[PDB]
Design a protein around this ligand. Structure first.
Ligand SMILES: N[C@@H](CCC(=O)N[C@@H](CS)C(=O)NCC(=O)O)C(=O)O
Ligand SMILES: N[C@@H](CCC(=O)N[C@@H](CS)C(=O)NCC(=O)O)C(=O)O
Lengths: 208, 208
């Protein structure tokens, strides 16, 4: 089946977990403590010396976006055709870009850079609002009329930014509605309310 | 047909260009000067306010990796099956990770951070050598026995690092052979020797 090896944080596994849960998939969580990580052996065996590590049967994957694309490809959450698959990629790459900036802030200069980051946020979120406006008036998903792996990734990005900058989505009616809508999907809603998700910190350094 | 809108640099378009050329595809280059960029209108119309911008018929794409995956998907350079597609993704994500560090060095702190970056290089390259060692002894491609978009992306990464740190591939027989082998592919070889490629700077700030 599936197994996700990660530290006890939502971080880069939040989206793939939301995906798995919403899609009714079963998976095993192999929690890696800082102690175990610092020992060195596990890290050494990781392709790029990092987590998450994912296992689908005997297929071992690394890279959160690889895991997302894999599940998307195998679970049919990658568009209806090639054009949509490309658009799904375009959205995900955008999410990744902002996620990297977020991570940089959180771990590199939260205190000094938070204000600047927040002033810049609107411009970083606008693209997704625009994508939504061009897709059935933002009444469905980020791309096409079926959910994709990019949706879960974008939803997580939006959720964590809501924590970082409460109200940041107020200026974006489509994104706000979108978040409320996806969060309301039965299985996802249940997962987001579970201790499994709720009792895990967003990041590893206690900042958010 | 195809059209790539970018600044007159290899940068993030080098891999997709190598791909297009090696695959015998025809494409139009729409060069964007710093003057034109600074005007503001073009940037404003770009989804994430950045280039490259790519056009395939009336399909407009943004994000270099999206373009790479799109061409890979439509040109059959994305693995033979889902398992390979995932591995191809894992390689590309790794390449992207190192490319971001490279770009950060080049534009953020070349002078002060070059030495540290270079000492760290071996550890950053090892994963690709390992991937090669696990795939037909590195006699073929990065994943499987057919070329993928990740190959062009990895090749570019290796080529630019050779310029940054001459000899960095000496400790890696598989990567070295791999570079020599792919660079020898007829169409690619011709492209790499063309003014189109040769007379374009690797980066926009003149560093490399
Ligand atoms: N590009 C990778 C990044 C992975 C990453 O940054 N992993 C961090 C935690 S989220 C890690 O393993 N840190 C431990 C280390 O680098 O030693 C991905 O998307 O999975
Ligand atoms: N994640 C994007 C990054 C694009 C990017 O960084 N573009 C730069 C040049 S390589 C740019 O457009 N700079 C101009 C600007 O940001 O205003 C991609 O992979 O295409």
């Amino acid at each position: 089946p599936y197994t996700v090896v990660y530290f006890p944080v939502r971080g880069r596994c939040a989206a793939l977990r939301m995906l798995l849960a919403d899609q009714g998939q079963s998976w095993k969580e192999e929690v890696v403590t800082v102690e175990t990580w610092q020992e060195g052996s596990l890290k050494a065996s990781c392709l790029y010396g990092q987590l998450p590590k994912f296992q689908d049967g005997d297929l071992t994957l690394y890279q959160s976006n690889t895991i997302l694309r894999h599940l998307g490809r195998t679970l049919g959450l990658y568009g209806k055709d090639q054009q949509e698959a490309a658009l799904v990629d375009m959205v995900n790459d955008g999410v990744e870009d902002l996620r990297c900036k977020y991570i940089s802030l959180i771990y590199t200069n939260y205190e000094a850079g938070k204000d600047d980051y927040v002033k810049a946020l609107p411009g970083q979120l606008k693209p997704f609002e625009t994508l939504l406006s061009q897709n059935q008036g933002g009444k469905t998903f980020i791309v096409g009329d079926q959910i994709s792996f990019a949706d879960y990734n974008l939803l997580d990005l939006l959720l964590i930014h809501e924590v970082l900058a409460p109200g940041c989505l107020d200026a974006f009616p489509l994104l706000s509605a979108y978040v409320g809508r996806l969060s309301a999907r039965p299985k996802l809603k249940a997962f987001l309310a579970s201790p499994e998700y709720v009792n895990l910190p967003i990041n590893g350094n206690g900042k958010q």
